[PDB]
Symmetry: D2
Subunit: 258 residues, 4 copies
């Protein structure tokens, strides 16, 4: 029996990177369907077609827009007959250094909108639908190693990921009465279009810039490792796990220097 | 020698509550000038007058407005010839329950703006001035017990205070090269106009609703206790303390239901 | 059939004669483990559990986890008999029946708890690490901590100290052994009624509901030993290939530890 | 009024290093008396004489021996009329690397005995006397930066300091009903005879081997900084602070390799 057999999932930010890998893995693990919610429509549609349109749909959705998220969740539940897992994974990272001394406030606003407002909207709207359906559920936010430690730059992003932890803890306490679990996964070293904003483009960039700060050697980091943690948390394998951040980061000593 | 002798401080949100108590205590501990930065102008002027105009000045300032904060810091440093302590203390708490299932998003936006954008602005702008002056400095944010734990409501506020911790940690790492310390204080049980938004108006409300969740008994909680922690962190008593959250909360078991 | 997420792995479960350890040994075999060695001081019970799992895939070895020579011998036997050592679940523990408040702390009873729960952990992590480094195939070491590993309690002070010490061991070992592709993590239960929890009045699932569940957020999901076993199997497997230095709580979201 | 005016303190491990500095500072801050409880008798007597025999006494005491600790506390209370602050500061660090792969178990036992058994004994016995006297009190353990993070060696020591945090958290919850506070201080970079066991003897050693891992620059680390944090926690400045670890470590990025 596959661990997500028959389950309906949403993956926000599923057009690329960790979200795409997670959508793919959820289908491999028996999901009835995965809805990819993203702003990249051509790319999202192509990912859905690649996974297979009988088990994956793309919906255009800005996670920070509550009406768009509500509409996307309603469509998901009506189309596929439920909503068992929400993976609130969409995020952004600025290319500017974002040290606190030279913090660009408009760029801070952009990061906080997607990474904190989007998380709050997705957790709220998933929770409402899960409470309505009465079948419990599993809500997962994609935080990051910077959710529990400071960094030498990317200060807005660090603040946003700490805020996600606060959301997860609070939501877990508030929604547990309805058998809804809320957790986060925290990656670090997966090269994606997002990490390219801070110069991490290739597996070699990961080795040169990130791995000196990571304990676990001989295990190259991948998007699929993060997807595995999300699938564990989304499944009944984690039936009694809530309020928790699960890092998939090789043991981060401290965040890399600038 | 008094622990803040000769120091110049800014207290944002200093017109009321913990900020007012902290401005008062900083002067008692020898601060040469304390600037109260607040949006309550009438009240802030009256508080500065009560503390004494020779030691305390009021500047109208929305902490989330970077130009206003920059102007207020420039005025402080030009008028008094320094800036040793920034206490970024302003905050807001909505009267709505703010459960995540029924979260009011515009009210979330307000809380995040004051409590996270205001913190970021004040830390940035204080840091710039402290780096320019070359004398080190101490920056303190007012977080709260909800900065390190979840709550059963006030979800926006919890998120905002967690974000403050991330700011403090990051800023401490980035500004330590210039001998600038960054820390937070985390209160819980002081009845103020802010806490009135969630039904905590009197010391008796604190006893009935909050104290069951607090370990330390027989010590009534006060604004002055929080001010003492801020004065410790602002002073050379804490010369090698940075990146830290200092809770003044009697040992919180969990947030109230 | 389940996913054979532990296909071919050789595991040791200390404290595997009972409770969470027994459930974990059983689940590891269900998930395709080559073998599980149950290392325990309860010989009659341990032998019976091994026979119940199946002697072709499970062996019992008499072993006091705080005795370094016994642990070393048990690991050597495991590796020689089954050709490897891929997972160590350092799960043995003890809990006193005495309240163990700090004001009335019984020091000899503190010593007993610290011996099994901290010395035993250190011995098992050391000796598993040595064998894993020797074999050159990486590995996964898991300690059974508890919800009290990351928070204070109103009694059981020795036990709380012991579980905090386990977290320090896990963090340190993860940092030191990562160079050899060895992962070190903990699982932290709370609400499984076992002979150990009976020492503090938690004997039945109803005791769990009455005394523990008021302090736990997640409702409608009765707590079981098997839930903890699932977390250990996740951490022991390649599903957690890049997870190290971490405590994974299986506790329904603990608000705070229950009052005395 | 000085912050420890009239208070009676015990500093375990007060014959050397941070404990000595803390005993000295407590007297400077007005303590009625400080009892140095240590196993190094000649050294402890020399420290007490230097601080001043009218305000400081030495008592021979192995912190892991419950009868000796009880006797020392009884002597303190009989001699000086109370017990307001217990600083459970004694600790040891092996010279061996103590990696987990090559952990020496008898040396692990030594570290765990002083650093965990001694902490438990001192917190228990101070708590008993404080409950008896009915005046509240402040109990402080000396933990360390390794109390909240892993290290690349000294594994026994890391375990011991994590256990201290568990003790402090638990004791704070259990003793708050009697207005007794329990906290820790966590140093990192004070060169002492203890740190000499891992090659840290001089200010230059600190700069070369420890400071790369510490955010705060331009502020040389000292024993007196740790003493200041202990004095804050021991005093009414921290009247509503309990269950907390207060790091005096310049912001530790991670433990040194
Ligand atoms: N890659 C890493 O190592 C790493 C480390 C820490 C955290 N994360 C987090 O992982 C998550 C996924 O990022 P990734 O690295 O896979 O990057 P990615 O660029 O591959 O994917 C991010 C996706 O989010 C989408 N997105 C952005 N704004 C959106 C909005 N308003 N509404 C809907 N979708 C939106 C993008 O269009 C994109 O498809 C992010 O939350 C990121 O912060 C990643
Ligand atoms: N009272 C408590 O027990 C408690 C607990 C946890 C955290 N806090 C925090 O303590 C801090 C001080 O609050 P308080 O309880 O003393 O309440 P308070 O109402 O007495 O003071 C808050 C002050 O902040 C000011 N302020 C609000 N928005 C502002 C803005 N945009 N710019 C400048 N000033 C602004 C208000 O005008 C007011 O004078 C807040 O950050 C609050 O979140 C308090
Ligand atoms: N049950 C829970 O809810 C819970 C909560 C928190 C932590 N834990 C931890 O889970 C672990 C397993 O305990 P359990 O609850 O399954 O109890 P259990 O009594 O079912 O099993 C404990 C086993 O450990 C063995 N053991 C004790 N001392 C030993 C030694 N010196 N050498 C070898 N084996 C020894 C016992 O003989 C027994 O078989 C323990 O570490 C415990 O502290 C359990
Ligand atoms: N120096 C640092 O930077 C540092 C860092 C982290 C933690 N610490 C902690 O600070 C505390 C003080 O250490 P220090 O560096 O000042 O060391 P130190 O060696 O100068 O002082 C330790 C004192 O404890 C005493 N002591 C040892 N065993 C004892 C026992 N059984 N009973 C009574 N007294 C005993 C010693 O005789 C000595 O006088 C220790 O707990 C240590 O672990 C220090
Ligand atoms: Cl990150
Ligand atoms: Cl709060
Ligand atoms: Cl527990
Ligand atoms: Cl240390």
């Amino acid at each position: 029996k596959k661990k997500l057999e028959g389950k309906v999932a949403i993956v926000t930010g599923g057009a690329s990177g960790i979200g795409e890998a997670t959508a793919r893995l959820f289908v491999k693990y028996g999901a009835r369907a995965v809805v990819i919610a993203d702003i990249q429509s051509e790319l999202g549609r192509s990912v859905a077609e690649s996974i297979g349109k009988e088990r994956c749909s793309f919906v255009q959705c800005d996670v920070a827009d509550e009406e768009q998220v509500k509409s996307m969740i309603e469509w998901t539940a009506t189309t596929y007959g439920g909503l068992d897992v929400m993976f609130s994974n969409a995020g952004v990272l600025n290319s500017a250094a974002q040290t606190v001394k030279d913090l660009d406030l408009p760029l801070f606003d952009k990061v906080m909108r997607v990474n904190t407002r989007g998380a709050a909207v997705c957790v709220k709207q998933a929770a409402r639908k899960m409470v309505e359906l009465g079948r419990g559920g599993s809500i997962i936010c994609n935080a990051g190693s910077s959710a529990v430690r400071g960094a030498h730059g990317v200060t807005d992003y660090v603040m946003s990921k700490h805020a996600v932890i606060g959301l997860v803890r609070s939501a877990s306490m508030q929604l547990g009465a309805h058998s809804i679990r809320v957790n986060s996964v925290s990656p670090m070293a997966v090269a994606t279009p997002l990490t390219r904003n801070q110069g991490i483009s290739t597996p070699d960039d990961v080795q040169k810039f990130l791995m000196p700060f990571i304990s676990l050697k001989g295990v190259p980091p991948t998007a699929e490792q993060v997807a595995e943690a999300a699938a564990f948390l989304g499944s009944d394998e984690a039936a009694f796990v809530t309020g928790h951040d699960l890092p998939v980061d090789g043991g981060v000593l401290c965040m890399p220097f600038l």
